[PDB]
Every structure is written in structure tokens, then in C-alpha cells.
Design a protein around this ligand. Structure first.
Ligand SMILES: [Cl-]
Ligand SMILES: [Cl-]
Ligand SMILES: [Cl-]
Ligand SMILES: [Cl-]
Ligand SMILES: [Mg+2]
Ligand SMILES: [Mg+2]
Ligand SMILES: [Mg+2]
Ligand SMILES: [Mg+2]
Lengths: 232, 8, 232, 8
């Protein structure tokens, strides 16, 4: 693609510049180019990839929700305004699906299969679950939901065997899987149970951590607690 | 309203 | 172009949806398509065009400033990091210039020449000044600065003859021309004089206005006052 | 730092 002529290190450098400039579409394109060089990604590089695409799809998801809400209102004594709301919601939806398909394609070709360490494999499987979850949010679907579930479950199984309960990757995975249960899978009790158990097992392991690791873990634990407060 | 992992 | 097959009214409708969804690039593309239908724009439509492109170029300008600052820091005991900062600043700069050229092209073909009423003609000439000003911010230039000056001056001459001193278009034009003087033309005294005179002449005309028009005018007057406080 | 007309 268009990044084929740029050095891997230059793509990484420019991804960091793009982040500083809040140019997340550029950041994602640079990181896609870096992945396509075919080498494995370091921890920092994995995080750049994740930040870039999370910001891109996050803006698409927010736009899609605005347009979907307008579309649902039009379908209630509502005056007919023609096909335009549906058309434009479909346009944004198709672009969102394209970004998800792009990320899933990078994971399948070939990030996941080359990821042998727990930290990398769990990271990528969580990403797979997340981007299938974003596809599920707009799907009208059972197979997409099962694909998200399967990726999250494999990541959970590895994380429980290979990582301590305070590990930020493990915590963020559990957080997002709990959101999947609550918002996608119609399983609020599973969401609540997962969030509670994750929080409590992390609490009990905080004593092993340095000041900096304690800050990292407790930040994510607070999101679990915020959700539990919303859900109960 | 549910919070997922931060974009960062 | 790609909007050639879409109805004018549908483009306007979708521009409004794009605004609600904060999808300003889409909004601008829809409004470009509407302009290219060849009919004059209403007041509301002119404002949609302006909002869309101001938001697009505003994000580019902010990114350009971040990257330019990093580039200037690298050119001070600074370790050599290669061509990447310059290359990426140039990429953003070229995209910014392209958006400005697009807007200026719409104004020249054929919005300005068909604009006969003061409200439309002043609006478009102000836009011309603004987008030449954005080109001047990145130029390394005398002719670009003179083009901005000339457009603003023609707009000022019409606005002073044809609009009351509280008219929000006239006020916003004076505000932006004063910014041109201060930030582009190295003329802070002219900037201060223009802002002061504009503010004082508007003050004296507020008594003629309704409650709603008073709110509209005083909001912009506050920006003139904020700048005067910064500049003096 | 100078303020120009709002994007809106
Ligand atoms: Cl559309
Ligand atoms: Cl396990
Ligand atoms: Cl570049
Ligand atoms: Cl005059
Ligand atoms: Mg190489
Ligand atoms: Mg490996
Ligand atoms: Mg027609
Ligand atoms: Mg006319």
C-alpha cells in the first residue's frame, strides 16, 4: 500500500507525531504500514496501533449513534423526510465496518499467529474481541457476537493462566468482556459477576506492586467500579 | 453509558 | 464530482446531519456539492458552508502548529532525528493548502460574482480573506498576504456603506481583519485601532436592537474586547 | 492566542 516505501522506523516515528497532533486517521495509516512490514510489534508499538484505531472507530461510533438516534426518531407522528437519514447512517456504518475489517485483517494476517508471549497474544485477542464487538453494535449478527465472545474467551483463558490479577492488560480485557456481556450479549448478571470478581482479585494482589504499577492497576479498577455502580 | 478501556 | 448525482436539497439535509454528528469533512463535501449545483446560497446555507470548512481547516491548523513547534525545537543541541518531522509537517501543510484552495475555488467559481446583496457579498469576501489568511500562516507569501488584505478591505468597504455597525457579519469581519493585522501583517497598532473603533461604534448602536439581536452582537463584541485585553 | 470568529 501507500506506506510500502516508508521505513518501518519512520512510520513509527510519524505515528507518534500524529498522536501528538491528534491526527488519528494518519496515526492508524502509519501503524497499518508498520504492521505490514511483517515484523512483530513491541509493547509500545502495539499500544500505538491500539490508540490509533480506537480513536478512529470511537469517532465513527459516536457519529453512528447520533445518526441512528435521529433515524429512530423519524420512524415514530414523525413527518416523512425521505431516504437521507438512512443513507447517511448507512454511509457512516459502512466506513465503520471497513475500519473494523481492516483491524481484524491485520490481526489475522498475521499478528495473532506470530504472537507467542502472553502479553502480546492477549493484547491481540482482546483487540479481536473489541472490533467484533463494534461490528456487533451496528449488526442487524449472531455470528459476529459469537466471534467477539470467542476471541475474548481465549484471551481470558490465557490471561488467567499467565498474568497476575492486577496486570493492566488482563484488567482491561476483563473490563471490555464485561461490557460485551452487558451491552451486546444481553447478560447483565455475567457482566456484574465478571466485574466484581475481577475487581476483588485485583484488590487482593495490589500489595505486591510498586507505586507506579499500583497507580496503573487502580486506574482500571476504578472503571470496573464505575460500571458496577451504573449496573447495580 | 458503560465504560470500556480508554482509547489510550 | 462525487456529489453530482445527489439532489441539492439532500446535500443540504445531509450537511445538517453531518454537523450534528460532528463529521465536518463530510459536512464540507456535502456543502461543496451543493455549491456546485450552481444556484446561489441562502443565509443558512452560507453558514453551513462556513461552519464545515472552518472546522476542517481549524483541525488542520491546530495539527500544523503542533508539528511546526516540534520541527522548530529539533532545529535548535537537538539530536538529529532525520527528515520525518519535516515530511509530516509538509504533508499536513499540503492538505491544509488544498482545503484553502478548494474554498477559494468555490468563491471564485462562482459564489462571489453572483453575490449582489451586501450580506452575501461581504460574507464571501470575508471567507476569501480568511482562507488567504490561513494560507499566509504557513507561507514562507507577500502576494498571499496582499490577497487576504484586498479581500478583507473590499468586504470592509461594502460593510461600512451597507450594514449597521452592530451587524454580526460586519462585526465578525472586523474581528478577523483585526486578527489579520495583528498576527499576519505585523501591524498591531492597526489591529488595536480597528478593534477599538469597531467595538465603540457597535456600542453606540445597541440601543436600536431587539433582545435577540443585542445578544448576537454583544457576543462578538466580547471577542473584540478579549483581543484588546490580550493586545494592550 | 488572538480570537477570530467562531467556527459556528
Ligand atoms: Cl450519504
Ligand atoms: Cl485459564
Ligand atoms: Cl509523511
Ligand atoms: Cl465604505
Ligand atoms: Mg527497512
Ligand atoms: Mg513470536
Ligand atoms: Mg435537482
Ligand atoms: Mg445574485
Amino acid at each position: 500500500g501507500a506506506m510500502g516505501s516508508m521505513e518501518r522506523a519512520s512510520l513509527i516515528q510519524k505515528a507518534k507525531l500524529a498522536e501528538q497532533a491528534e491526527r488519528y486517521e494518519d496515526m492508524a495509516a502509519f501503524m497499518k504500514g508498520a504492521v505490514e512490514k511483517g515484523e512483530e510489534l513491541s509493547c509500545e508499538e502495539r499500544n500505538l496501533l491500539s490508540v490509533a484505531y480506537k480513536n478512529v472507530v470511537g469517532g465513527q461510533r459516536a457519529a453512528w449513534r447520533v445518526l441512528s438516534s435521529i433515524e429512530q426518531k423519524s420512524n415514530e407522528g414523525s413527518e416523512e423526510k425521505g431516504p437521507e437519514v438512512r443513507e447517511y447512517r448507512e454511509k457512516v456504518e459502512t466506513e465503520l465496518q471497513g475500519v473494523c475489517d481492516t483491524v481484524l485483517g491485520l490481526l489475522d494476517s498475521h499478528l495473532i499467529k506470530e504472537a507467542g508471549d502472553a502479553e502480546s497474544r492477549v493484547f491481540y485477542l482482546k483487540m479481536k474481541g473489541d472490533y467484533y464487538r463494534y461490528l456487533a453494535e451496528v449488526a442487524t449478527k449472531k455470528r459476529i457476537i459469537d466471534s467477539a465472545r470467542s476471541a475474548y474467551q481465549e484471551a481470558m483463558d490465557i490471561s488467567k493462566k499467565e498474568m497476575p490479577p492486577t496486570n493492566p492488560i488482563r484488567l482491561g480485557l476483563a473490563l471490555n468482556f464485561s461490557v460485551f456481556h452487558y451491552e451486546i450479549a444481553n447478560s447483565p448478571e455475567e457482566a456484574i459477576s465478571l466485574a466484581k470478581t475481577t475487581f476483588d482479585e485485583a484488590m487482593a494482589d495490589l500489595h505486591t506492586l510498586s507505586e507506579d504499577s499500583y497507580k496503573d492497576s487502580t486506574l482500571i479498577m476504578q472503571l470496573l467500579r464505575d460500571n458496577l455502580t451504573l449496573w447495580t | 453509558r458503560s465504560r470500556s478501556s480508554l482509547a489510550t
